């Protein structure tokens, strides 16, 4: 939920860690076109470190 | 003998079954795929693997 994002060529990098993982707030938005979860099943994130 | 000039695409394998298998068990059925945080119902489109 930021007013300004980055462009496709100048894609941003944000490193955030040392925290509670909090995979529940990310489902706040309804109109999600894609929620691709290759590699890790979308419901088994909340117990991984 | 088993290889074909037209390709043996008929042979299949059930890699993506949901729950666990026990040794010496028989599992051949329709095997509908219902995963994700949504009811797939077999006809949705997002997660009909």
Curated annotation (Swiss-Prot), chain A:
Residues carrying a glycan: 1
Domain of life: Viruses
Subunit note: Binds to host ACE2. RBD also interacts with the N-linked glycan on 'Asn-90' of ACE2. Cleavage of S generates a polybasic C-terminal sequence on S1 that binds to host Neuropilin-1 (NRP1) and Neuropilin-2 (NRP2) receptors. Interacts with host integrin alpha-5/beta-1 (ITGA5:ITGB1) and with ACE2 in complex with integrin alpha-5/beta-1 (ITGA5:ITGB1). May interact via cytoplasmic c-terminus with M protein. May interact (via N-terminus) with host bilirubin and biliverdin, thereby preventing antibody binding to the SARS-CoV-2 spike NTD via an allosteric mechanism.
Role this protein plays: Attaches the virion to the cell membrane by interacting with host receptor, initiating the infection. The major receptor is host ACE2. When S2/S2' has been cleaved, binding to the receptor triggers direct fusion at the cell membrane. When S2/S2' has not been cleaved, binding to the receptor results in internalization of the virus by endocytosis using host TFRC and GRM2 and leading to fusion of the virion membrane with the host endosomal membrane. Alternatively, may use NRP1/NRP2 and integrin as entry receptors.
Name of the protein in question: Spike protein S1
Lineage: Viruses, Riboviria, Orthornavirae, Pisuviricota, Pisoniviricetes
């Amino acid at each position: 939920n930021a007013t300004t994002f980055a462009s496709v060529y100048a894609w941003n990098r944000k490193r955030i860690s040392n925290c509670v993982a909090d995979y529940s707030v990310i489902y706040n938005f309804a109109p999600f076109f894609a929620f691709k979860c290759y590699g890790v099943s979308p419901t088994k994130l909340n117990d991984l470190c | 003998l088993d290889s074909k000039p037209s390709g043996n695409y008929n042979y299949l394998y059930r890699l993506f079954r949901k729950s666990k298998l026990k040794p010496f068990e028989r599992d051949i059925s329709t095997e509908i795929y219902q995963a994700g945080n949504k009811p797939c119902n077999g006809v949705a489109g997002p997660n009909c693997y």
